[PDB]
Amino acid sequence: TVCNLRRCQLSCRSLGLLGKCIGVKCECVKH
Numbered sequence: 001t002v003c004n005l006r007r008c009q010l011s012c013r014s015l016g017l018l019g020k021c022i023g024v025k026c027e028c029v030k031h
Contacts, residue, residue: 005019008026012019017030 003021003024003026005021005026008021009019011026012028015028017028019026019028
């Protein structure tokens, strides 16, 4: 349906960095 940003974010956060949901694809990015 969509992409759970909060979920995607927290997902990346696992690594320690931050996550972002762009369109329908989330990725782990550093601040």
